[PDB]
Amino acid sequence: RKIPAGPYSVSVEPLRDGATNEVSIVTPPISSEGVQEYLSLAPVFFMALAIFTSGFAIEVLRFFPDTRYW
Amino acid sequence: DLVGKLLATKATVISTLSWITLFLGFHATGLYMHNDAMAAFGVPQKQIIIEPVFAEFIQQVFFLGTPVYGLGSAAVSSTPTLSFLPIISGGDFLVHHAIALGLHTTVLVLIKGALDSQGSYLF
């Protein structure tokens, strides 16, 4: 990598000979284990927990408006 | 001595005062915000009005000479004496909880500073 390219690059080395019929997939090389690990992050996990709790409260308020059963 | 015992368990004092202040502030602020939302949304009935039944009980049983609330006692004094004691209602509960929050937070800061004058792990 003599050409200065950023880390985690899906770019082929720009120092190539005559036109190459090569396969260079421009899509992130993500991993299922990596994706699951990322969605288990404290920010992600706790924001998902907060969203779930908020939505559960929303549905309880919708189907049981006010505190009618106090 | 007394002060040495207070200093040795200063962590307990500060932590419990912090819990008291957190509870009082959370609940007073939350009830006030709930009442704000209910009054704003045109539904003043759905406010959380916790009747100050303990202070009303004290007032009726010990101070008042006529049945004003009727809880604890309902006797009327034959020869009452006069004063300017206010008659409490629902809002006074929240206001007294705000007062308790303020007093406890002030005591928390003062006690925490005085007891950490002997040193914290940052100093």
């Binding site: 985690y8 992130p28 990596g34 | 045109g42």
Partner: protein, 645 residues
């Protein structure tokens, strides 16, 4: 691989025991976009810009979607006088009172200026905005992960970048907008104002429509084309055509062979370009805020007073924020450059420039606020003839009341814009000048005393954002350029708050005055602003306390949301006071006691609880202060201008 590196910052945070603290989390957030100097810095910057463009496209698509589905845009087209609402509110909790929310963003007037008459067009624009956002995200990905380094765009390819922006982006966009106006925005507004139905916009591009129905090229068309809602669009089209022509011609008639960034590193070059760009964008926002009510350009815009007020205030706030950020990034670029010898004249006149600005700020402050306090004192003492007013010592702004010049075939803007100014305008304008000067003083001081100062002589070794140098030399808190931006943000808040207060009171005063009736033609003073905006008490009574009735009596009405946001803004502003007045050490000791309480119950969190760092505490306090003040003004202005207009 890439997914593994997505949480790479968190993995590095947990890898070392030194980064297993909450302070590490706050640093991870604070250093999020602080792209460190590296071979891929320019790639990172450009990709971040493209991602932000995609985010803005998402926002535009959402706004058009709300206009299409959750707005009374068609009813507003049939009757512009109705309240523009574009945000339905579902019946959850008890919020049903505010179900139609009067949107004051001016999207209805904008869309009418764009020739949009059907909600299907808004749906199409929302879909294409989502498509454009997807394309921008794809491009940002590509540039970050597979593209050129972009390191030559600010130093080597700056001529190409500037020329492309001058000709292609700016000129061709203005020309294309002029074409859009002339072809579908003028004819649609003609057929709407005349009430003769509007065909499909593409049918206007037929060469058989009004384009060739009549070849007359002046104000004469079918029946009587006397619509004055339509003429601003004609002027806008002419302006865009002329601007495109002059941009294209001057771009090839300009040198552009002078890049002042040869002597700056790539990171410092990026920061300086960002600073100058922020300055330009902020002054453009302020100029647009002034011109929105200075000149009518959108159909039925001046009639919708809440929209005018919201546009003015929002763009003033954005301009102030960007003007502060301009100096912020100038300071960042100066302090983070290895050899920033370019600013040698100003770093060697450090004390001269700073002290002259200090005298200017002192003079302006004492004079302006002394005029105000003198009026307060004289009115309190019952001496109205000793005040500074029209019926007293008159501070008439003479320099305002003259624009006469040789005509040479001109008109309209050859005067004071048909408005007379008085003592109150003079005093409030000097208050504005003083507050602007003080904000500039703080920002310029932060820039100049960024690498070294008489107090601390190695401030360049301390980088841009540091809490202090220590309690020595009497105390050196808040010496950093970051802290100077931190104080300049407060002073920008003060300046813009006074500016928007002046605008809002003048606007309400003019609305009341034009509500004379028709017969009432001696407005005397009246002009509640002109008669009362001469005292601090006058403001406190006739503007704040007087207009607060709308926002505090909004409970049970659709403006109850404004009332609640008023309260929440006060709450956040006092919480800011909490963060700003206090210090890190106390909270650290309190957290020590709380953490002992945790350890006593075998809880023991390993991400050690640390209170916010000094700079983090200042930043949180400033964020809450700006949020609370701006939200209070937002709720107050919107409730006052919607209830009363």
């Amino acid at each position: 691989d890439f997914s593994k590196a997505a949480f790479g910052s968190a993995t590095g945070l947990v890898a070392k025991a030194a980064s297993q603290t909450t302070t590490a989390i706050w640093n991870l957030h604070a250093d999020a976009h602080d792209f460190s100097n590296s071979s891929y810095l320019s790639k990172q910057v450009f990709a971040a810009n493209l991602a932000h463009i995609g985010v803005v496209f998402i926002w535009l698509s959402g706004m058009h979607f709300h206009g299409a589905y959750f707005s009374n845009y068609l009813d507003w087209l049939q009757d512009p006088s109705i309240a523009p609402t574009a945000q339905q509110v579902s019946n959850i909790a008890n919020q049903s009172v505010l179900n139609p929310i009067r949107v004051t963003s001016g999207f209805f007037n904008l869309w009418l200026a764009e020739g949009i008459t059907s909600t299907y067009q808004l749906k199409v624009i929302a879909a294409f905005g989502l498509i454009a956002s997807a394309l921008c995200f794809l491009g940002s990905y590509f540039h970050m992960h597979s593209s050129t380094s972009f390191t030559r765009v600010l130093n080597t390819k700056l001529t190409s970048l500037s020329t492309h922006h001058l000709v292609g982006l700016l000129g061709l966009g203005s020309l294309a907008w002029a074409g859009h106006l002339i072809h579908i925005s003028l004819p649609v507004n003609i057929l709407l104002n005349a009430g003769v139905a509007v065909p499909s916009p593409h049918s206007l591009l037929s060469s058989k429509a009004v384009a060739t129905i009549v070849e007359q090229l002046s104000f004469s068309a079918l029946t009587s084309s006397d619509g004055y809602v339509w003429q601003p669009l004609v002027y806008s089209a002419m302006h865009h055509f002329a601007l495109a022509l002059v941009l294209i011609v001057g771009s090839i008639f300009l040198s552009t062979a002078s890049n002042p960034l040869m002597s700056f590193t790539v990171g410092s070059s990026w920061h300086l370009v960002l600073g100058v760009q922020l300055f330009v964008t902020g002054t453009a926002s302020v100029l647009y805020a002034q011109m929105s009510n200075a000149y009518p350009v959108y159909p039925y815009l001046l009639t919708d007073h809440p929209t005018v007020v919201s546009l003015f205030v929002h763009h003033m706030w954005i301009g102030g924020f960007f003007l502060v950020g301009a100096f912020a990034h100038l300071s960042i670029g100066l302090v983070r450059d290895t050899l920033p010898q370019s600013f040698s004249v100003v770093l060697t006149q450090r004390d001269i420039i700073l002290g002259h600005l200090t005298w200017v700020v002192a003079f302006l402050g004492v004079h302006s606020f002394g005029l105000y306090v003198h009026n307060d004192t004289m009115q309190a003492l019952g001496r109205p003839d000793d005040m500074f007013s029209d019926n007293a010592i008159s501070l008439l702004p003479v320099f305002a009341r003259w624009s006469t010049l040789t005509l040479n075939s001109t008109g309209s803007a050859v005067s004071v814009l048909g408005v007379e100014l008085s003592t109150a305008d003079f005093m409030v304008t000097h208050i504005h000048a003083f507050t602007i000067h003080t904000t500039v003083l703080i920002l310029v001081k932060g820039f100049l005393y960024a690498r070294s100062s008489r107090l601390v002589n190695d401030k360049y070794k301390l980088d841009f954002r540091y809490p202090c140098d220590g309690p020595g030399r009497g105390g050196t808190c808040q010496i950093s350029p970051w802290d100077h931006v931190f104080l300049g943000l407060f002073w920008m808040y003060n300046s813009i708050s006074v500016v928007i207060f002046h605008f809002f009171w003048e606007y309400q005063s003019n609305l009341a005055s034009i509500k004379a009736s028709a017969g009432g033609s001696i407005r005397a003073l009246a002009s509640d602003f002109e008669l009362n905006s001469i005292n601090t008490n006058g403001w406190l009574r006739n503007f704040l306390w007087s207009g607060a009735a709308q926002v505090i009596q909004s409970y049970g009405s659709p403006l109850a949301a404004y009332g609640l946001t008023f309260l929440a803004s006060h709450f956040v502003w006092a919480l800011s006071l909490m963060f700003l007045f206090s210090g890190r050490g106390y909270w650290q000791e309190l957290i020590e006691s709380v953490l002992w309480a945790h350890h006593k119950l075998y809880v023991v969190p390993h991400i050690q609880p640390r209170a916010l760092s000094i700079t983090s505490g200042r930043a949180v306090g400033l964020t809450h202060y700006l949020l609370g003040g701006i939200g209070t003004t937002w709720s107050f202005f919107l409730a006052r201008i919607v209830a009363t207009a």
